[PDB]
Write a protein that binds this ligand. Structure first.
Ligand SMILES: Cc1cn([C@H]2C[C@H](O)[C@@H](COP(=O)(O)O)O2)c(=O)[nH]c1=O
Ligand SMILES: Cc1cn([C@H]2C[C@H](O)[C@@H](COP(=O)(O)O)O2)c(=O)[nH]c1=O
Lengths: 200, 203
């Protein structure tokens, strides 16, 4: 069994990559694809509070994300891994450090301690970092947007802090894949990295 | 303004103590009495998930409790303090250590960091710890119970770990902590608590 997470900022193709990588592995492996909270009722109830939250305080969010992370972890991921399944998870501890910790400014270390409490030791066996540059990331975002408009300065500034944040969290479970490439190549490299790990 | 927390396990008179102390201060000071989540919507939505949680994971509880703690803190306590009020709060950070940290066995340091994350530096100015022995706590607990039955061995064992947990948190060299002997009749516990706060509030 294997617990694989997918990390990257918007504009990195993560949704497409994970979705396509899942179809290619479903043939050979007993695999599942999930995204926090993953249908977990308590998990959803908790994440529904941040979505309906206005001007909600960032530490409060950091914590609700940590709780949702744990429910999804104890009620769905662990059980799947105890039955020998390969789990492909969209976002996990590293999104929080990059987003909440770094982009939002709370502090990586605090947020790291918070999440360490939530996962109680269970780290991914492999984490695919979809490394995209702010400019590429920017252009995929616009490409995929409703009216194809330019982004608000707030957003560009943030996306950049996200990416910068990820660049710090990378410095063995991490495998960096070049997301500046067309998606099919990103998918191919991702698939290859996963197959290679699974072989071993 | 002043931020004063009340801490004690079951059987220590805390609910009675706090209410009675609130009325005595109401005359002289501009004071409010709250209990997390204290009516704060987001706080209540958060705490309701635990209450409706069966077999819910102790860490998940810990974090929802901390979340609810911070909403209450930022949306109700800080605003009140900012208007020069005395805020009496029933339970806070030290309950979590005792209950979650120690009694539930998660680990005091981890739960302490979880709380350090939640309160972001806002500690109570004064923390009144109602110090009752397990045995007295036990009899108060049974007195107050629906049918006055003897407690299950799970509960006695748990009430005792809580206390033990609270004994450890006191030997903080911390001065925010004042211990009141909750083994006395409630009226003396009320009086000593009242006296402590007044004294604090005079300075
Ligand atoms: C997992 C996670 C996502 N996010 C953000 C990124 C997205 O805007 C949204 C969820 O990401 P996704 O829908 O692309 O998986 O919330 C955080 O801020 N913190 C987190 O811990
Ligand atoms: C403060 C706190 C209380 N209980 O109840 P009362 O009548 O003593 O307020 C918990 O289970 N966890 C916590 O964190």
């Amino acid at each position: 069994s294997a617990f694989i997470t997918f990390e990257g900022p918007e504009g990195s193709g993560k949704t497409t990559v994970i979705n396509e990588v899942y179809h290619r592995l479903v043939k050979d492996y007993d695999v599942i694809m999930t995204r926090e909270p993953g249908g977990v009722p308590t998990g959803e109830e908790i994440r529904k509070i941040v979505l309906e939250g206005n001007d909600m305080d960032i530490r409060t969010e950091a914590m609700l994300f940590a709780a949702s992370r744990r429910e999804h972890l104890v009620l769905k991921v662990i059980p799947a891994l105890k039955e020998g399944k390969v789990v492909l998870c969209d976002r996990y501890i590293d999104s929080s450090l990059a987003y909440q910790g770094y982009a939002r400014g709370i502090g990586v270390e605090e947020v790291r301690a918070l999440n360490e409490f939530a996962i109680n030791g269970l780290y991914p066996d492999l984490t695919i970092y979809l490394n995209v540059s702010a400019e590429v990331g920017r252009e995929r975002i616009i490409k995929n947007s409703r009216d194809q408009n330019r982004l608000d300065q707030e957003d560009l500034k943030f996306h950049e802090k996200v990416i910068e944040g990820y660049q710090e969290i990378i410095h063995q479970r991490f495998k960096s894949v070049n997301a500046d490439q067309p998606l099919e190549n990103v998918v191919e490299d991702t698939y290859q990295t996963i197959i290679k790990y699974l072989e071993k």
